[PDB]
């Protein structure tokens, strides 16, 4: 029989391993051109303490018109302070995060963090403009927001011993 602790022990080594790798990759740069940062993967793992939830939300899907809460995630990787907005996938992922971020300055390790860069269609309808209510679209900066899916795991370190392990293993 395999013990359930082996799940907690696999994510122990999975979090710390992916932390070292991606931490270095984020210091180096997120995808230098066509995949050439350091270790180019879709999902990363890092550590930071909870800042705040922004009062505003982000429209993540136009078809089904859903907006997701902003969990402000800034941390100093090496020299640079990477300040990007942590997002949730579903309503269940949003609610578990807001119920988890009850403690401010909560130092946790966000595992399996899937980065999403903003974009849209670009050629224009030029037709069926009867649906329009007179509203010309404003200029939005296409930023990358760090999405948290249902495969993600946010591990809270109540102490600073796992933080100690990670920062001394990575080094800057």
């Amino acid at each position: 029989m395999e013990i359930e602790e082996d799940l907690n022990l696999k994510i122990l080594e999975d979090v710390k391993k992916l932390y070292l790798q991606s931490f270095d990759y984020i210091k180096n740069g997120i995808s230098s051109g066509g995949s050439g940062g350091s270790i180019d993967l879709s999902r990363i793992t890092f550590l930071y303490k909870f800042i705040s939830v922004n009062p505003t939300l982000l429209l993540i899907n136009e078809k089904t018109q859903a907006k997701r809460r902003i969990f402000q995630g800034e941390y100093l990787y090496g020299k640079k302070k990477i300040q990007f907005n942590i997002i949730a996938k579903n309503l269940e992922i949003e609610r578990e995060l807001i119920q988890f971020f009850k403690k401010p300055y909560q130092c946790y390790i966000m595992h399996n963090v899937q980065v999403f860069q903003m974009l849209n269609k670009n050629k224009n309808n030029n037709v069926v403009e009867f649906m329009d209510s007179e509203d010309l679209q404003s200029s939005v900066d296409s930023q990358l927001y760090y999405l948290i899916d249902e495969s993600s795991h946010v591990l809270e370190d109540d102490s600073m011993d796992f933080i100690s392990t990670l920062t001394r293993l990575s080094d800057s």
Partner: peptide, 14 residues
């Protein structure tokens, strides 16, 4: 369909 699926305002870096 899906929040981050086809018809999203954001696509995964890959």
């Amino acid at each position: 369909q899906d929040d981050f699926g086809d018809g999203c305002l954001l696509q995964i870096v890959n």
